[PDB]
Structure 1
Amino acid sequence: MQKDLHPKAVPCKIIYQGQVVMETMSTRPEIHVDVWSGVHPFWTGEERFLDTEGRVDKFNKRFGDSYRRGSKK
């Protein structure tokens, strides 16, 4: 569990697949891909209870960094 984001959870799930559209605008569609993948944000530097660094990602970030809920800057 070393990839997440401290404030909340955001790694995982994510199943993509492509097709060849062209539908509600006269005639149906068609199905293709069948794949799974990653998907996330971004981490950075701050500190908790005597050093630590943090990590977390974008969102939460803008947040908890702006402030702090279980450690600080």
Structure 2
Amino acid sequence: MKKDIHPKYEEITASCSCGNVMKIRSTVGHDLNLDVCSKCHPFFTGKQRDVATGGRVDRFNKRFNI
């Protein structure tokens, strides 16, 4: 790499709400607090639940009984 032209790229710590402590090299300098990491992102549960089509016949039979 060249000497002077590049920004400072320093290893810092980024911790998350799921407690995922992760040390990365970054240009931030200070420590980082996250919200979701790849461990705690609802890609493996939430996107599966979040379709939620529901049935029209089951709503109909649900609203009463004959």
TM-score where L is the length of structure 1: 0.24
Q: Which has more radius of gyration?
A: 2
TM-score where L is the length of structure 2: 0.25
